[PDB]
Symmetry: C2
Subunit: 428 residues, 2 copies
């Protein structure tokens, strides 16, 4: 409430960073929406509209959005593949965006934890709140679970978005709006992988193979390991990337381009299967050269999938886990039953994270023990462009972000957004 | 000690069931041994020799063998594939057999738990006893772990075998010698699968898909489920087998021959992949018809491998585990990454079991809550024949057994073995 009266008048439509009086809610807002006939490339399917501000219920909340995050799923949405969201919800239009920072503007009748004017970031997991798994087990195992901004169109690429109370976490005051908004989805996901599957969690001492260490997922495996006592073993495909990952806490690096052990699992007992095992073993020593010899990784941290899995299942210690949330290079997974059963290795699928997980992760960032690693930030009018950049992989390592009501890069407080000035949302 | 003096004199070689005085150990014994040049079909590679009785150490024990069990591994040994045991141990010859019932005849200097004349059955797991995993963790994760009678040639197809104290469990007085000796290896294995991988263990209420329900492994999944409150869902390939498995506790049956969803995973997005999912779904309802609808199995209990895995990974509930110890139909495992990561399913390899596991299992049998299911029993001179029968799958459902010092089928006590009479070990 330092800035309660330096605001604007009560009206039904504001421009970017034109702060309304606290708790006043305009009939309308500006947004980046998708409709079923637009479906296609981000610059084609994401177009700019003026829509009504979301109606909210008993346990929901409304957020004035300062910045947001760019993730792959916003592309799958604009694409309508692998599926269209309109085959998931009954909506006429869809507002994407699954990461965010901003202010709470209005709360439901039953909301006590959070209060109007509180500064927050947003976790993307939602459920109906009332079955066995959401009340005693793991809420990610409820059929009711879904991802906000993907399987819902009340996402964050708009002046306002609608979220459940159970999606809100406190914002780190030490970050810019854009930094606060880039990491939660990707950080929380990686946190579930490494701490959310007892008894195969990370402990001081362990060695963890991290695939694609420069990726949005990669950078967070590396940091979380280091920040906990463990020893991340990064993997990359460009030697200019070496310094980067190593300044993060990495305890070694390796480059996949040196080998050929890539591709599905050669049918067994065939020479290819024998030439395959030959190089892959080279890959194995590559670790021991870092880890010491006889020292296989406690956890493989997977996501490329089809092309590497055969290998990942080989290098993991007896009693070790190979966890993963994607298959960026194919889904025909393959592996040699012999290796995982004799050495009793766990192959564990994983998928985002839940509030208590996202918020344990958020704490590492609040204590400054982990850093969002924001790759770069685009402005409100470049949002579809920002997505196109991910599409064909031309983005820099780390996590992109885009601006909303925050009118310029580098802004931290709401006072900063005011004095920097309102901005036209729809000009051309 | 009811029969301490109805024995024979002190000599250095006895015939079958010619009981020596308690604690007297003959210089020599009769056995079924393998040597590297014999390698081949069981009837070729298992030949009959007279060898010295094993020397034993501080924590080891010597057992007078009444009956033993027949398992696949005795065939892989005689075969010398996938490997020869002589590439594992430095021995000139090898005595196979990984299951057994009998009397303790001699104990090491440091053996307090067990005493001479005690009646026992044998678990096949061994380790060196002195690293981290054997002293605080799971001893199956020690590099020192190995299977007795396979990776060692002091097995049970002989008048005497040598075992570690940590392999011994008490024998159920209510069984015949052969019954007591058929089940431990196969029972314990299945017990680890269903109770040895927290937090995905069996609980009253759960539904568990059991592949090959008539198999030595199958029958024990079914019984253990039922005996615990769960609901085994058997799978078979002969309708004459239906009554069998259902009298065991099964709560339903299904027959794989009706479908075609068998084989590796059709490359994705291809019509075959679409026709594949079509039948497999039929397979899924087949369950709900038994389980109720919306009710996916908590645990798939796998072992056929390559040909079914694609399917097994589909039918398991979100948060469910697919555990397995074999790949009897290939090792090029395959599955759709999408299914296991979104529904966060665990794919867990497993391999035999450890003492505390084998002995929890043994308790079910001691309370008469589980039954060995002995398929049939061959005599001492048919042991290689018994193995040949497994080789090409012509054995009846359940678990085979063969006789040693027990001179006739149906004998229970040692008194019974005496009055039934000694028997010539080597006649032709
Ligand atoms: N379903 C979920 O729960 C969930 C949540 C978040 C993200 N994801 C997924 O996880 C994936 C990546 O996330 P991200 O933030 O890391 O995106 P990203 O920044 O594009 O990550 C790509 C990184 O992976 C590495 N990589 C790409 N292909 C590789 C290959 N063939 N072999 C080895 N490394 C390879 C690259 O690093 P190098 O070439 O230097 O090794 C690259 O830096 C995407 O599929 C995304 O959808 C899934
Ligand atoms: N490494 C370990 O820890 C360990 C320990 C013990 C056993 N094993 C292994 O487990 C396997 C079987 O053990 P077992 O005692 O059950 O031997 P088994 O008695 O021969 O089991 C075979 C059973 O599996 C079923 N089956 C065979 N092919 C099938 C297929 N293509 N699809 C569906 N079902 C099929 C059959 O039943 P239906 O045709 O009626 O369905 C048959 O009754 C072997 O590979 C054995 O080596 C491994
Ligand atoms: Mg991002
Ligand atoms: Mg058997």
């Amino acid at each position: 409430p330092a800035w309660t009266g330096q605001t604007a008048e009560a009206k039904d439509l504001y421009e970017l960073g034109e702060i309304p009086p606290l708790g006043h809610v305009p009939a309308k807002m500006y947004a980046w929406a998708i409709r079923r006939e637009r479906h296609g490339p981000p610059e084609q399917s994401h177009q700019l509209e003026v829509l009504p501000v979301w109606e909210i219920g008993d346990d929901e909340v409304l957020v004035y959005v300062m910045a947001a995050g760019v993730n792959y799923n916003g592309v799958w949405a604009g694409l309508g593949e692998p599926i269209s969201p309109f085959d998931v919800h009954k909506g006429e239009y869809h507002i994407a965006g699954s990461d965010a920072s901003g202010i709470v503007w209005k709360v439901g009748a039953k909301v006590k934890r959070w209060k109007v004017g509180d500064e927050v970031i947003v976790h993307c997991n939602q459920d109906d709140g009332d079955d066995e798994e959401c009340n005693g087990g793991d809420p990610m195992f409820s059929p009711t679970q879904r991802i906000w901004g993907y399987e819902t169109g009340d996402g964050s690429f708009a002046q306002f978005c609608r979220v459940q109370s159970r999606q809100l976490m406190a914002r780190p005051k030490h970050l810019t709006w854009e930094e606060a908004a880039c990491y939660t989805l990707t950080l929380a996901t990686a946190y579930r992988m490494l701490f959310g599957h007892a008894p195969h969690t990370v402990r001081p001492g362990q060695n963890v193979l991290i695939w694609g260490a420069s990726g949005g997922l990669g950078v967070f495996g590396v940091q979380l390991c280091a920040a906990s006592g463990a020893n991340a073993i990064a993997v990359i495909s460009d030697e200019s990337k070496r310094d980067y990952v190593m300044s993060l806490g990495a305890k070694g690096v390796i480059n996949r381009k040196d080998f050929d052990c890539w591709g599905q699992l050669p049918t067994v007992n065939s020479p290819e299967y024998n030439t395959w095992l030959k190089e892959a073993r080279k890959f194995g020593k590559a670790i021991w050269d870092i880890t010491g010899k006889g020292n296989d990784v406690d956890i493989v941290f997977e996501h490329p999938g089809e092309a590497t899995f055969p290998v990942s299942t080989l290098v993991a210690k007896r009693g070790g886990m190979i966890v993963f949330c994607a298959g960026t290079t194919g889904f025909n997974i393959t592996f040699d039953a012999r290796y995982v059963w004799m050495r009793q290795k766990r192959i564990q699928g994983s998928h985002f994270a839940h509030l208590k997980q996202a918020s344990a992760a958020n704490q590492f960032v609040m204590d400054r023990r982990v850093d969002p690693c924001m790759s770069e930030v685009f402005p409100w009018d470049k949002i579809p462009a920002a997505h196109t950049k991910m599409w064909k992989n031309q983005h820099p390592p780390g996590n992109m972000a885009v601006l909303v009501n925050s009118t310029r890069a580098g802004l931290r407080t709401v006072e900063d957004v005011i004095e920097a000035g309102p901005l036209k949302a729809m000009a051309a």
